Write a protein that binds this DNA or RNA. Sequence first.
DNA 1: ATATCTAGAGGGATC
DNA 2: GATCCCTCTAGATAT
Lengths: 528, 23, 505
Amino acid sequence: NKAAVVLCMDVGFTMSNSIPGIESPFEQAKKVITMFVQRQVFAENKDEIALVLFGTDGTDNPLSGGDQYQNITVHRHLMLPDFDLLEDIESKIQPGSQQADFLDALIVSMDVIQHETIGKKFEKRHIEIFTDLSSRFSKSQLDIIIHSLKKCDISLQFFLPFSLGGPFRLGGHGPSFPLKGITEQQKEGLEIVKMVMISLEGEDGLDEIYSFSESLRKLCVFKKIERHSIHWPCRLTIGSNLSIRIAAYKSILQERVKKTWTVVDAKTLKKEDIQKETVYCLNDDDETEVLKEDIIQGFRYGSDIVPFSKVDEEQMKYKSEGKCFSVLGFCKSSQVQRRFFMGNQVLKVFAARDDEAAAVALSSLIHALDDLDMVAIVRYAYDKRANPQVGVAFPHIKHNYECLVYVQLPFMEDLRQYMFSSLKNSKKYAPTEAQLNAVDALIDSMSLAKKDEKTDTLEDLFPTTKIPNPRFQRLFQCLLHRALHPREPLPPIQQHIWNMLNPPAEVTTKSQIPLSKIKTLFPLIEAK
Amino acid sequence: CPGESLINPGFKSRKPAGGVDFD
Amino acid sequence: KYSGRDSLIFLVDASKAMFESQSEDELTPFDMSIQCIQSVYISKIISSDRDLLAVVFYGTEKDKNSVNFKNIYVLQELDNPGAKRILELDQFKGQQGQKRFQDMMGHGSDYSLSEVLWVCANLFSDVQFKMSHKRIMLFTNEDNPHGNDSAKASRARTKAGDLRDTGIFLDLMHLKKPGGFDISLFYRDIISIAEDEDLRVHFEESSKLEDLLRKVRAKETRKRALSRLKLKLNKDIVISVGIYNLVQKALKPPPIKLYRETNEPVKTKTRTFNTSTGGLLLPSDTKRSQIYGSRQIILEKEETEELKRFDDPGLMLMGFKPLVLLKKHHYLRPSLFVYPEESLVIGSSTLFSALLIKCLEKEVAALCRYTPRRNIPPYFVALVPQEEELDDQKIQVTPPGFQLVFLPFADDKRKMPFTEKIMATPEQVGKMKAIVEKLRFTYRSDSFENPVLQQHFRNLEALALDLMEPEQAVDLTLPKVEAMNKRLGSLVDEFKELVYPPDYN
DNA sequence: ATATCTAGAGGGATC
DNA sequence: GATCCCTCTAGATAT
């Protein structure tokens, strides 16, 4: 449920230096923190966010006992984020001149998250550190820090100017701050951070060290504080004697804006002065007025119209027996084409929570489907009043979990029976060999995957499925700009959004000559 | 045109559903 | 065309031979043809209620038309099908309906095919709508209508040739004849088909009438492009394509509101005025607001539209990605179909075909940025090449083109609770494999019907036609529990013994 | 109680 | 311009 997040940002002087052509790490960290706080505020999440700055000229922290934990200030205590915090992040916070050890900052964040959560109930405690690791540190309290994280159940995430591992584009896909630029002090900081992440989580902790540019195009900041979906309990039935207790979650479900635009008067900025009403008028002349109680619902049947009252429809409606998840049969996986998937969601089906027998039975079914290369056609009804659907449940096996993925299949009435002219058989639209070779070269040049050497693994150069929806961040930016400066036009779309929405520059550069050949080989004329 | 419906010209003829028929 | 309608005229002979029968169990040709027309009417009402249907009888004693030709009775003119026409036709259905038809319209009189086709042509020309198809279904069971008289037959062939010239498709729906219909005696040179595919004598009647009696209830929406966008390679090589929905969730028709007494459609108007004077609030004196807990953010409607604007409508080719990188379980919304258009950018079809061929050869998909229309945030889509597929009957099962697959964003995927993996022993997997093999069936896309929609159609038909009791639609999505219980047998018990402990439900 | 079903304002296609 | 179709948005409302 509610979670307590502490953002420990680096502010000292070394975080302000910039290589020309590359944005300063201070600005990138500010952008990442702004995105995080924007999402937290404008989604009205109940998570409480703190903000600790280390490296500032001043010193204001609970552990400031004198000649210790200096140049560290707790800018914002644990509370619900508000527009004020966004205002300080965007304008008030300024880079400092001193330096501080990031372990001291981690200890300060520990104390903030410890002696500010008593009384309040928090499901998760998270700390996100933004730093450049260019400052000298002392590894004297490392064991105590690790033990404190382990005992207090506090996560960790590290953000660095350089990725762990052409011109540099912030938020884009491709190379980042050069791997040679990392200095010896930065190397020592990186190795200490890596050892901390290893001792904290394990080998997967290496995946929790991100870069600012790659963080601006991922949801890694919200990964540890997001609330998982609720399960839908049912029973997988094969016949009237076999039943497996299952729980189904929603894997893919398009996210839309939750807050609605409220229509208000332009003079008073209030909504009670504006209301909407509907007037019922006969289609005949003179536009007579009809009240709600004098209208009965009817249906269209050819050229005639038949009255069909709501009570009559409810009595005549197709009655479903209720919630069900029943297997109709098993068919070869090649018979269920991917192009026929319907619906607006994808369900992943596990066994019932902490149920060993159900887990064994479901794993047996999944492995049986996988070995025979078959899928299950199931009848799925969410609720008693829900319209029953027919869908496909195909096995999905990974190195750590197994599940059945359910996608709705079409009914015979959802299929459209148009016919299209054949393209291959056409003698007027047949490309010649030169055009085919040109298109072949173009496809080769614009490849979005790298066939890695020494292993049969395809690396995705443009993994779009990890890119956040740009509309939400754009809307949050516009809303914040309007709230802070309600006298200016909407700002332009941020450059990193365009960078993260565009393919790597290598793809574009490699596809200039082939594209010119395509242009000079395919005459395209826009009809008047 | 082959497979064209008699009721609705320009469309394909819809065959009866049939449902599930085990082998 | 798109706005064009389909015009169908049922030409039913009223000769005495049509009222005979070779067996009491068998239906006489007249009521069989009447049931044919009734099935067509019902299917068209469910599907294509915007089309035109007419019914004409020739060979009757009484005459009714716009020309006053003898022995021609136009029961219905070219008009949209309705329940009243269905009931009027039902008045002649079956036994005692044939008697009513013979009592109110004569039969057994001499006719002339040229006059019949003249009446049909006048019926086609009288109505003022724009139509794509002008079809005639001739219901008869006489091989040579004018076998004895040569002049009338010759005039008939001349008139049929004229109608073919002006665009009237003439079909033939012969009923049962004791001596065999013997097509190609007279009808060969008039029927609009290219040739008599079967030149036999056709002792039987069910040539294609089984297709007509077979009722399939589906809307059958006309073909129309969702958007005529532009596929841009970089910024200059721009081809014109069109987006179609090959699959779309069929919705129940929306109920209409009508007057309580007169039963006439009622128009709905919405108006907004301030609650201080009642003066209508023109959409230029109001603003959009959002209160985020304590602070109100005020934006013009133009600003709210502008903040959603990223790119111009069209598809921006980002690159090419191997098909193996497109995961099956990353389904977001139903995929679309991309087909080239030569009406806007001449030469688009050649480049589209080359791209399709090369993508099929290399098993790649064109990853593009999709903006369906103005002021809409873009998505990332994959154009997967889709080769044309023809079955054994050489019909277009799958059209050639591209399949536009929507790729989910990072926030369209939900994190899921951690679960300890509990694998199964090979014995249990083998038992479940046997169970799976027992219940194997062949799946086709058009195998299941929407029970809700079918029940709604049956209820509407019963209400309109005043049926005593509505027909209950058969739910094919219900598992055949008895059948699979008999098919499995003791496999379920053995599987439960292997997996489920003896104290589990 | 979240979700689903249902119900209303819009943007192109096509006349 | 008018009509139908299809997202999209917003609201209503049983399990």
